[PDB]
C-alpha cells in the first residue's frame, strides 16, 4: 500500500535479533544493523545512494536510542543494550551521566511502557525519523517528505484498526518524538564530549558518524 506496516514490522524483527565504553561499543555495533534495517524499510533503497547516506547520518543517533529504549521496557531501572549488556542506573550515576540516563528512563522508556507501544508502532516512528526532509543535502527533500507522510497515513490507519478503543493513540505516538529529539541532541553533546578528550575512544564506524 505504498508503505505497508507489515514490512516495517519485518524490518524491526529482522534485526532484533567502563560503562561509557560498553555503551559506545554497542552503538558502534548497531550502526551496522541500522543499515540493514533501513534497506528493509519500503522505498528507502529506491532513493539516490547519496540521499540514503544523508538520512542515516542525520538520524542514526535518534534511531538507535528509540531502539534500545523500547527494548529496555523489559527491565526496571536500566538499559538493555543490543550486545546483551545491562546498564543499571548506579553505573550511569558513576560515569557522570545519571541525569541524561534518568531522562531516557522517564521521558522515553517509561512512556513507551505505559502506552505499551508495540514493535510495529516503534518501527513506524523510526521510519518517520528516518525520512527527515530537513536533512541538509537531499536531492529531493519533497520526495522524502512524501515518504514520511506515507508512514503517517499507514501508522494512523494501523492505530485505528488495532486500537479502536483509543482515538488519541496516534497523537500520543507522534508525541514521543519530541523527547527522543531533545534526548538525542544531549547524547550527541555528551558523545562529542567523550570524543574531544580521547583516552581510548570508541570504535571506528561510530567515530565516522561522529564527524
Amino acid at each position: 500500500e505504498d508503505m505497508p506496516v507489515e514490512r516495517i514490522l519485518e524490518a524491526e524483527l529482522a534485526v532484533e535479533p567502563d560503562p561509557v565504553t560498553n555503551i559506545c561499543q554497542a552503538a558502534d555495533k548497531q550502526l551496522f544493523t541500522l543499515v540493514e534495517w533501513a534497506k528493509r524499510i519500503p522505498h528507502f533503497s529506491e532513493l539516490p545512494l547519496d540521499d540514503q547516506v544523508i538520512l542515516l547520518r542525520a538520524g542514526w543517533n535518534e534511531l538507535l536510542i528509540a531502539s534500545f529504549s523500547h527494548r529496555s521496557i523489559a527491565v526496571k531501572d536500566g538499559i538493555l543494550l543490543a550486545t546483551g549488556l545491562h546498564v543499571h542506573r548506579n553505573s550511569a550515576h558513576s560515569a557522570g551521566v545519571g541525569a541524561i540516563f534518568d531522562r531516557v528512563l522517564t521521558e522515553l522508556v517509561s512512556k513507551m511502557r505505559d502506552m505499551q507501544m508495540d514493535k510495529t508502532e516503534l518501527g513506524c516512528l523510526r521510519a518517520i525519523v528516518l525520512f527527515n526532509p530537513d536533512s541538509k543535502g537531499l536531492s529531493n527533500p519533497a520526495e522524502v517528505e512524501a515518504l514520511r507522510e506515507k508512514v503517517y497515513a499507514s501508522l494512523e490507519a494501523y492505530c485505528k484498526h488495532k486500537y479502536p478503543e483509543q482515538p488519541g493513540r496516534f497523537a500520543k505516538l507522534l508525541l514521543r518524538l519530541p523527547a527522543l529529539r531533545s534526548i538525542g541532541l544531549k547524547c550527541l553533546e555528551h558523545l562529542f564530549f567523550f570524543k574531544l578528550i580521547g583516552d581510548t575512544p570508541i570504535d571506528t564506524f561510530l567515530m565516522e558518524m561522529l564527524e
Partner: peptide, 9 residues
C-alpha cells in the same frame, strides 16, 4: 563516508 557508503551499496 567509506563505511556507511560501502554498506549501503
Amino acid at each position: 563516508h567509506k563505511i556507511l557508503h560501502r554498506l549501503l551499496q
